[PDB]
Write an enzyme that holds these catalytic residues in place. Sequence first.
Site, PDB file in Angstrom:
ATOM      1  N   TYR A  38       0.711  -1.066   0.210  1.00 50.51           N
ATOM      2  CA  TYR A  38       0.046   0.389  -0.022  1.00 50.51           C
ATOM      3  C   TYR A  38       1.262   1.340  -0.371  1.00 50.51           C
ATOM      4  CZ  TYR A  38       0.506   0.726   5.040  1.00 50.51           C
ATOM      5  OH  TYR A  38       1.542   1.454   5.997  1.00 50.51           O
ATOM      6  N   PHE A  48       2.535  11.062   3.933  1.00 47.01           N
ATOM      7  CA  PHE A  48       2.642   9.687   3.101  1.00 47.01           C
ATOM      8  C   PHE A  48       3.234   8.506   3.662  1.00 47.01           C
ATOM      9  CE2 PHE A  48       2.155  12.444  -0.842  1.00 47.01           C
ATOM     10  CZ  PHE A  48       2.298  13.512  -0.228  1.00 47.01           C
ATOM     11  N   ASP A  49       3.402   7.450   3.732  1.00 50.70           N
ATOM     12  CA  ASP A  49       3.250   6.178   4.190  1.00 50.70           C
ATOM     13  C   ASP A  49       3.240   5.254   2.875  1.00 50.70           C
ATOM     14  OD1 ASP A  49       4.162   4.572   6.294  1.00 50.70           O
ATOM     15  OD2 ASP A  49       2.041   4.357   6.177  1.00 50.70           O
ATOM     16  N   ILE A  68      -7.990   0.313   9.704  1.00 51.62           N
ATOM     17  CA  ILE A  68      -9.822   1.552   9.820  1.00 51.62           C
ATOM     18  C   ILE A  68     -10.720   0.861   9.145  1.00 51.62           C
ATOM     19  CG2 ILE A  68      -8.315   3.405  10.123  1.00 51.62           C
ATOM     20  CD1 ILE A  68      -8.302   4.374   7.406  1.00 51.62           C
ATOM     21  N   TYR A  94     -10.174   7.628  11.095  1.00 53.03           N
ATOM     22  CA  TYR A  94     -10.318   8.105  12.433  1.00 53.03           C
ATOM     23  C   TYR A  94     -10.626   9.328  12.587  1.00 53.03           C
ATOM     24  CZ  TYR A  94      -5.605   5.817  11.307  1.00 53.03           C
ATOM     25  OH  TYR A  94      -4.844   4.488  11.113  1.00 53.03           O
ATOM     26  N   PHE A 111      -5.842   5.903   0.104  1.00 51.91           N
ATOM     27  CA  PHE A 111      -4.883   4.149  -0.171  1.00 51.91           C
ATOM     28  C   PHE A 111      -4.732   3.798  -2.055  1.00 51.91           C
ATOM     29  CE2 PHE A 111      -3.752   4.092   4.226  1.00 51.91           C
ATOM     30  CZ  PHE A 111      -4.771   3.909   4.618  1.00 51.91           C
TER      31      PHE A 111
HETATM   32  C1  LIG Z   1       2.272   1.877  10.470  1.00 53.62           C
HETATM   33  O1  LIG Z   1       2.296   2.909  11.017  1.00 53.62           O
HETATM   34  C2  LIG Z   1       0.931   3.433  10.391  1.00 53.62           C
HETATM   35  C3  LIG Z   1       0.461   4.077   8.752  1.00 53.62           C
HETATM   36  C4  LIG Z   1      -0.658   4.513   9.054  1.00 53.62           C
HETATM   37  C5  LIG Z   1      -1.624   5.462  10.818  1.00 53.62           C
HETATM   38  C6  LIG Z   1      -1.072   4.795  11.844  1.00 53.62           C
HETATM   39  O2  LIG Z   1      -1.382   5.822  12.948  1.00 53.62           O
HETATM   40  C7  LIG Z   1      -2.136   6.321  12.446  1.00 53.62           C
HETATM   41  C8  LIG Z   1       0.327   4.301  11.755  1.00 53.62           C
HETATM   42  O3  LIG Z   1       0.419   3.763  12.629  1.00 53.62           O
HETATM   43  C9  LIG Z   1       0.360   2.612  13.519  1.00 53.62           C
HETATM   44  C10 LIG Z   1      -0.447   2.057  12.504  1.00 53.62           C
HETATM   45  C11 LIG Z   1      -2.206   1.815  12.245  1.00 53.62           C
HETATM   46  C12 LIG Z   1      -3.022   1.731  11.211  1.00 53.62           C
HETATM   47  O4  LIG Z   1      -3.098   1.943  10.251  1.00 53.62           O
HETATM   48  C13 LIG Z   1      -4.547   1.602   9.456  1.00 53.62           C
HETATM   49  O5  LIG Z   1      -5.301   1.728   9.649  1.00 53.62           O
HETATM   50  C14 LIG Z   1      -4.436   2.136   8.249  1.00 53.62           C
HETATM   51  C15 LIG Z   1      -4.311   1.369   7.204  1.00 53.62           C
HETATM   52  C16 LIG Z   1      -3.233  -0.061   7.444  1.00 53.62           C
HETATM   53  C17 LIG Z   1      -2.549   0.813   6.794  1.00 53.62           C
HETATM   54  C18 LIG Z   1      -1.961   1.940   7.242  1.00 53.62           C
HETATM   55  N1  LIG Z   1      -2.586   2.696   8.107  1.00 53.62           N
HETATM   56  C19 LIG Z   1      -3.105   4.577   7.613  1.00 53.62           C
HETATM   57  O6  LIG Z   1      -3.641   5.430   8.241  1.00 53.62           O
HETATM   58  C20 LIG Z   1      -1.555   4.770   7.879  1.00 53.62           C
HETATM   59  C21 LIG Z   1      -1.732   7.250   6.849  1.00 53.62           C
HETATM   60  C22 LIG Z   1      -0.475   7.224   7.695  1.00 53.62           C
HETATM   61  C23 LIG Z   1       0.135   7.750   7.187  1.00 53.62           C
HETATM   62  C24 LIG Z   1      -1.012   8.438   5.574  1.00 53.62           C
HETATM   63  C25 LIG Z   1      -2.320   8.546   6.052  1.00 53.62           C
HETATM   64  C26 LIG Z   1      -2.365   6.676   6.419  1.00 53.62           C
END
Ligand SMILES: COc1cc2cc(OC)c1OC/C=C/COC(=O)[C@@H]1CCCCN1C(=O)[C@H]2C1CCCCC1
Length: 121
Positions: A38, A48-49, A68, A94, A111
């Site tokens: 992703y 970005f991530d 999420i 969130y 995403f």
């Molecule tokens: C791997 O690190 C992160 C990545 C996202 C969010 C996070 O926390 C809000 C993160 O910290 C811990 C993990 C949370 C889980 O994240 C999520 O549910 C969604 C879907 C899985 C991939 C990660 N994710 C995220 O929202 C990222 C976020 C990071 C910033 C760019 C936008 C997306």
Amino acid sequence: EQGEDITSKKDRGVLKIVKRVGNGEETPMIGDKVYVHYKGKLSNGKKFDSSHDRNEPFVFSLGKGQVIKAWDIGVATMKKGEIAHLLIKPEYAYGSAGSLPKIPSNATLFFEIELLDFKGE
Ligand SMILES: COc1cc2cc(OC)c1OC/C=C/COC(=O)[C@@H]1CCCCN1C(=O)[C@H]2C1CCCCC1
């Protein structure tokens, strides 16, 4: 605000486009271990991530609450090898509370998700 409303409530919260078509009849069932890559971002373009920055697939169990709402919903529509884009309102992400310091209140997220593989619990 292009793309298919894959929400139950039909409130255009989660919009999907398939960018590259997978194959198989099968989409993941609730509780499958799911393997994706992703690239993700806020829509305001300030964070970005990517799975690739960890140089390893991202793993999670579908519908077992570990990502999420929108991911559990979105990934359950995808087939192996599908690339899709999801545009996600904060209700499916969130929320008004955000998840500081990474995500601000009421953020819309984008995403690109590649469903690499899925296996039964
Ligand atoms: C791997 O690190 C992160 C990545 C996202 C969010 C996070 O926390 C809000 C993160 O910290 C811990 C993990 C949370 C889980 O994240 C999520 O549910 C969604 C879907 C899985 C991939 C990660 N994710 C995220 O929202 C990222 C976020 C990071 C910033 C760019 C936008 C997306």
